[model samples]
Target chain A: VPELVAWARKNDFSISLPVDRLSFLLAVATLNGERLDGEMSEGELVDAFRHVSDAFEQTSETIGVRANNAINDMVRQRLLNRFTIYRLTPLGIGITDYYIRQREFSTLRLSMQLSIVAGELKRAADAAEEGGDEFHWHRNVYAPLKYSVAEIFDSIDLTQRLMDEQQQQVKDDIAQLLNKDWRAAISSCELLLSETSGTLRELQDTLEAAGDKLQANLLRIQDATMTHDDLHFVDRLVFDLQSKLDRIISWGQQSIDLWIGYDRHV
Target chain B: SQTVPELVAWARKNDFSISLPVDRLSFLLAVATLNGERLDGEMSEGELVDAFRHVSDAFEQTSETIGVRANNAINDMVRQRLLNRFTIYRLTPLGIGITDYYIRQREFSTLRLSMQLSIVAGELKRAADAAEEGGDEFHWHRNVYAPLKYSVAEIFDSIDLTQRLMDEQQQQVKDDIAQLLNISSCELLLSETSGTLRELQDTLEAAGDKLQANLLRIQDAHDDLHFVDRLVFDLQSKLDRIISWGQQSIDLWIGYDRHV
Candidate 1:
């Protein structure tokens, strides 16, 4: 709790005003603290914010930017947004806590996001070596690896965006239904279904592209003058990455299905 | 034929020795004549027939003695080149069939003795040529000529039974062909077709039997030797080496046959 208060004090974050806004901040802070062990990357943090924005859109019907707005606005005003590129800020820690307290946010979801971020961090670590070498290896090996990484990232980003958009639509539809706004709920559910279909297509394309990139890297290594041991190393790396991407894609599909089913029940 | 010199050079470079039976040389000369290669007029038909008769006589005489003597005579003849070398390039179906029979017969001792007899027979025939050419003072014909002739005669008698069986089978084929044609054939017609077939089948069968016998004889001869005797042990070792060398030679010859 002192860590929480201290973080708020250091960041000049005031949680003394609106109860819901304060709850949101505390929840985000809690979530962020849990994610400290999680080692969330810049891309993953942005993805988390986007999820929060989507959740807000679900509950509010309008893109009012309630919880996400509070957290991002504070960060933006403090000029702390850039710090997310390297480490989590005090405000980020607070936002994570607030989201955890709300219980609406899942630690599992954050963990999944962080896992992806960790992968990127590892790539960044490798990129450091390449950059240090004036990207000499990058011109040969690193460039191809970077191209593959970029393709995988783009695919993951597209899948994540679709997942978020579909999830928000489902949540909105369910909220409207609970409020007894039958017409809006049905319309939203129908739109959600359409978006879910589009999202699935996008997810498939993305996952397939990710798989292709992984395979391409293997082929690149094979076609090169790499020694047997080096080829084996690259092969193992590609296999591990492909397996991870496959698991993520499977989890994503299950999540979409769950949300879609939940929308029907609502 | 154009590649003969190259092949000969290769063999010579590899230190491979060539030895031929005098009868086989005669057969080659006969084939050359058949192909219209004219011999000098001095080489009369009487001399040709006399040489052939002497070959047949030597073939019978060599069969009477021990196998070693006949082999020695062959080695001497080969050294002299009074006989030329010819390999049965392709193992014909008939040749293989006869070889299979010889294998089944398992008469290694008799087959080996018969082979040595044939070798001596060939040498004696060559000696006869030397005698015919140089008269009484012919060196080989004088020194080793008598036993060589005697060994050939014995060999011819020893293999006569087996040869008759092969010839009979061939005669059956000829009769079938003659019946199919519904015509009676003279000795000339029969010799050109059926008689030649009979001769070829018998010769091939005899050669196969001899080869198989030689292999088995070497094995048996090793078994017979005293392990304690250094001379016997050395001889066995040399025999084994020669067997392997001969196999390699035959394989090379077979390979060349395929290419040619």
Candidate 2:
């Protein structure tokens, strides 16, 4: 969470969490499988994103606390799929919330969303009353032991500084992880033009081959009653990419054909 | 005389002929490590061929594009360089400048992150100094600014040193995959004018003569040529039959072949 604070200080993304931000994040990444670098002309994704947005907006309205702007921008950017190496994993959202809180606490303590002294006064007074309720037997011992005992000021400020420094160090590493490793699952699909290309059955087989990474085929198989069509490799991918499959079928065929006959187009 | 490393390092900044920036950096590293042993403009005929093998092997190891027409490029570079028909590995200004501005876009992300850190450090220092100068024990600077400044500056110093080494030291880096691109006109004829096959015919023959050094002495010399030619033709059919993943990668970069 401290690292999240440091990360937020260096990075900022703003969007009103006008919707379930977690669902929105999940929807963006898993909604259409993988995205093309053409940078968001997909109507389906936009609609899905809007749906996610509305739920989050409703949540924010109920909670009175909006999500971080950076989180919003991440959702926006990934939604667009613009040659990006980012996603809306739940862990990221959790870290972002924690970071926003850490930074919020730090900045609040320094600035004023109700002064630190005022907050401390409210806290001690509340404790003061709680500590006194020991009745006739408790006496003066209960009050001081529970609420009034104070340690003399010491230079634990160094420890605070050290912890703060550690958080910044962590932020730096997370920033790199965000930059580099986000693409771990991102292997470019081997979009090859076979002499005797493929069929939906074969594409389905291929998807199953990679079932560990992609659960689409498994989902499709589990559907049981779904009908199979004579979709070409490209068409199959389009149906899958758009059901949605990616890395997918029908447009895959057209692209291969187009690429094969690129001579005419070029 | 810029070394291969120097040229690659310089070319990378400008982001020229690189296909994948990440892949290319390591390519340059592999090639740079071979600077004189085979990278020199003046290596023997056999040496440059071995260098080509090393380059191709490096790409193959990284699962990068080992284009169908890789030899044509090596052959052409030698034609363009090998004086009096003795094969020389000519380092073209064009070859050195392979990585232009294509990959620079990807390169700048790191810069943006680095710049953010610097600005954060400066802002924290200025804020902390302002608070310290006020000399009030109860000031926000005394409570918030000092520790914030200390932590921020310490991290920045670590970052600053990392960047300093990059700037001051010979941080060896290069990327040459697209330099590794096939005489990729994929055009056999176009390169005919500035191409490989016929252009390097004489040198190839001489290199072929060196190949005949057959010092190990093949027992079935005639059978070898026929077997090799058949293999080459088969390799072509397979090459033609398979999909061009290379073109797909480029198309993806330029915003085509989108999955979603």
Candidate 3:
């Protein structure tokens, strides 16, 4: 597990904490949850340990030693970026949030937001044509469009992960057959599977619509530089998203088949 | 859920023969056992072959070879006393137990445990009440003491096996979670599973408490016999561990569901 943490550090993708301290970290995260800046004061950390110590009837000093050890460990690991005003790094924030609840980021939410971004891009394109200004296109349109494209990429990555986890959860429930009511697990799995299929369809339809919309207006925009170069770049981004979506949908279908076989055998 | 190691261990423990063909035959025998138990205590060779053919069709196997395989396996079981055939195959006691254990062994074991536990608890309660009212020592020793002693041993095995099944289920869940990208968390279906463990633990604890309360009366009634005291004393810790193991499982599972 230490080797896993080292590997994660090398990858610069995630953070790993010991399972025993997870509840403590969760409590710490809760303290920082409502704060605008997501920082915890050193005094607050001490107070948190005091509260936890009282629960176990341990000395404050005993709990304080453990707390400070964790604080320094997290700091050395780069999870905490500040000293007295300790704060989670951006990486820490994301990973902490992930461990806290595993709240899902849906394709529907991302695609819906992306549609608004698409509308802005269209308006920017119209303004770029009328105004004939490269700076306006670069600043108002291309910059955020590039950011939106990257956001779509990351969201797609997240979506892939969430889908995988959900599918695995269903498979585990089916195979174990440990649920109180035997049929309850089956029904719950079917409900989740149906919702997953619905989300995929929504995402595919939205992506296709956006892709076609961008492609259609690309040829009609008239200006050679903005039309061919800039618009084509956006088209390429959409196509990549579409391709990734297509791949995951195939995986989803395979998962669906695996789950369907469970019913057949039963 | 019975792996090769477990099945082999089971066959070794019970002194039965096993092979790949024999295993597939065991599954078919399980289906036959269910029917026989539900309807009649007899299954003709023709009916057994028909059952094999039905399952073989699901596996997309040829009808020609399946009959032969089925016959060979049946002959093996007969030699081992798993079956007794006099024109019609009858499941010996061993046959019924082995077949039921092979198919959904966890489910069969748990229900059996509950039934046995319930019966033993009821018997202990009645015997304790009768002892309090000056019931005869002869009947108490033969009926209550003997059955309780045997039931305790059987119940221990059932509880131990149930715990293993549960541990397997927990490890499988943990392995599945390990395969996932995220570190964290279920409701509804999962909470219901948590509830199931809780209910089982509750039953175990209640039985433990009942035994604890009745042991004074039981021990006083048999004051002259140190052996009866030993028997009653042995099960106190057995019940303790049973209740402890049950509570331990409940906590672990409840914690997982909380995160889930």
Candidate 4:
């Protein structure tokens, strides 16, 4: 028992008072559901904080923080369902305070809109590349897509900008939380954005590629150096380009659900 | 009353996956109009193959999507995108559906996958009521209106996701549906009737019959993807693996209704 304190000291974290492990790990379990229902025992409480205790007891105490973090990263990834955040507790003395949250997913509407709009943008750019003359390509196809891409950028920009503001609105409560407890926080949005951003590069690249073809076509028509065969080839290239773009957007949007559902630690 | 060029322009404008150029698209649609309603079009199977060989057989050339294609296939698509100069075959669709069946198929598929997903305390009933009371529509929304909106996360991952992801995933799904159903945004209590749910499912079942790309030959706008002329490059697109859930086509060109 005394050794636990000594272990905490050795691990560079003073338990100050014994954490009971439950209060803190339980605090770490903040998932907001439409309903709290009853909390199912995964033994989710035990599973998360064990790494904290194990760090104190098992690892080389002097080298503990490193191991503790590695373990809790997995913890952070796994802690899911029905709890939002409340303040975990006090400062240097007791555990941290925390709360649970449920709020309107304001961003859902915006995100859904952006997702559909992105599809349209891809479609329009694809049309520009596939057929249409210089004027048809630029006016009807290229123009609407260009305008829509700007619109999507603005929607996502606003979403990211206002996220923290919205986050501030949905919070409440407090509990006695601890060191590893705070570290095991599951902030899902950051990583989701990163993962989703990867899919969007395909978006930008596809757009850029179509733009290149449009540019090439302009040059061909400008020089009066075009053939029916050339337009046909461009049409094929462009439509192929269009299909791939559509698939990427479709897959990208679907991946967000996957990202939301699983902590993609790997 | 649309012509081949109009169909080509329409598919192009809509960004259809069954995307094809004016030429091959014209050829495929022309083929569809022939051989009667089930396509009364004919030349000999060998010559049909040659005629189609010259035409791009992309969307028209495929059926691997319903999850019924041979997995280990050899074709010439560069990551399912590029139609390589020296290429091969097998992932496909025959859409340009003349803006017909496949477009409806897409709409129906969206309903099936999205509806199978979630339910809440009061959310199911509103949609179900809408479906029941709505006369012939038997639907909450119109026959071909935009009532069918979809979200990306409305996915059917074969793999299970983690707990936190699942929680948020469920919530996210709820968010998507609520917006579509016009529900959650106005709620104090939480729940739904299965009106929209059952309606969506019914629509999906009816659409399922029309889902098969029945020309079944001619494949896609990609020549390589097109089984018409196995050597045609103009229509080749990419397909790496053609397995169960593997997206490339099944090479049963010999087993198709059209061609040699």
Top candidate by DockQ = 4
* Model 2 lDDT tens row, A1-266: 12222232243322222124434444443432233332223344444445444433445343312333434455452222222223222222222222122322132222221122123223433343344333411222222111111100001111222232333333344345446554551231112222113322343343334333324322332232133232132223223222322222222333334334522321
Give the per-residue lDDT of model 3 (tens digit) for B67-117: 787787677666654555541554543343334333332331243345445
DockQ preference between candidates 1 and 3, better one: 3
For all candidates in order, the CA lDDT equals 0.37, 0.30, 0.51, 0.29
Q: In order, what are the TM-scores of chain A for the candidates?
A: 0.39, 0.19, 0.65, 0.26
lDDT of 1 by residue, B1-260 (tens): 22323333333343422222334333223322321112212223333343334434434444344244434543443343222121101111221222222222222122233333344334444434443343333453342333222333323322332333333333344446557566344344444543343334344445545544333332332222232133323333333332332233234323422332
Taking chain A of model 3 alone, its TM-score versus the true chain A equals 0.65
Question: How do the candidates score on chain B by TM-score?
Answer: 0.20, 0.21, 0.65, 0.19
TM-scores for candidates 1 onward, in order:
0.24, 0.16, 0.39, 0.19
lDDT (tens digit, per residue) of candidate 1 on A50-103: 444443344544334443465565444321232212223322332232223222
Which residue window of length 10 is worst by lDDT in model 1 chain A?
A78-87
Classify candidate 1 by CAPRI docking class.
Answer: incorrect
Q: Give lDDT tens digits, candidate 3, residues A98-148.
A: 444444545545454445445544764565466456556554444433433
lDDT for model 2 comes to 0.30
Residue A31 of candidate 2: its Cα lDDT? 32
Answer with 1 or 4, whichever has the higher DockQ: 4
Residue A241 Cα positional deviation in candidate 1, in Å, after optimal superposition: 3.2
